[PDB]
Design a protein around this ligand. Structure first.
Ligand SMILES: [Ca+2]
Ligand SMILES: [Ca+2]
Ligand SMILES: [Ca+2]
Length: 181
């Protein structure tokens, strides 16, 4: 699973505030709160809801306040969480990631219309530390926007999070690495 592992290594590095190669729940929750408040302009109410949910999400992966976790244990923790949460999702049940994604959604939905516009998505992608062209940002928006409505709903954004945090690499390759001639 090199692609899932790679997303997770880049995220571990992003949330490892002191850059020492070990991570705590304090680092992870600190950096996530800092971004929602200072990059995405969350209100106090918004930030507290997000804090509680992100704490439960990252806690589910086995991270704890006051404890430093090394990479092997970190990634095994995410594997375990992903496996349990994908079972819940398969049974149409509530997940920790869905609860997190709900609190985040309210914050990135700046115009409170219940859908994420392209502009809203550009701000969110930037908040996660991504630097990329307009064209690349638009492509990942189109990928997220399954019904091509032009805005991203809660279900689309849930699938987005599930794909990033939990979904393992496809078992088989496609002809042309999945490209179309
Ligand atoms: Ca650290
Ligand atoms: Ca909106
Ligand atoms: Ca849509």
């Amino acid at each position: 699973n090199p692609k899932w592992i790679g997303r997770h290594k880049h995220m571990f590095n992003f949330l490892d505030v002191n850059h020492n190669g070990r991570i705590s729940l304090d680092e992870m929750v600190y950096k996530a709160s800092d971004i929602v408040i200072n990059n995405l302009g969350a209100t106090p109410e918004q930030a507290k809801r997000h804090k509680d949910a992100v704490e439960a999400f990252f806690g589910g992966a086995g991270m704890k306040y006051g404890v430093e976790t090394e990479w092997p244990e970190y990634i095994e923790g995410w594997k375990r969480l992903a496996s349990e949460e994908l079972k819940r999702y398969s049974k149409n049940q509530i997940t920790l990631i869905r609860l997190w994604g709900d609190a985040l959604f309210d914050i990135i939905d700046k115009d409170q219309n219940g859908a994420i516009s392209l502009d809203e998505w550009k701000a969110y992608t930037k908040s996660a530390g991504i630097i990329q062209s307009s064209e690349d940002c638009e492509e990942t928006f189109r990928v997220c926007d399954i019904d091509e409505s032009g805005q991203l709903d809660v279900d689309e954004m849930t699938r987005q999070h599930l794909g990033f945090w939990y979904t393992m690499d496809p078992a088989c390759e496609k002809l042309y690495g999945g490209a179309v001639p």
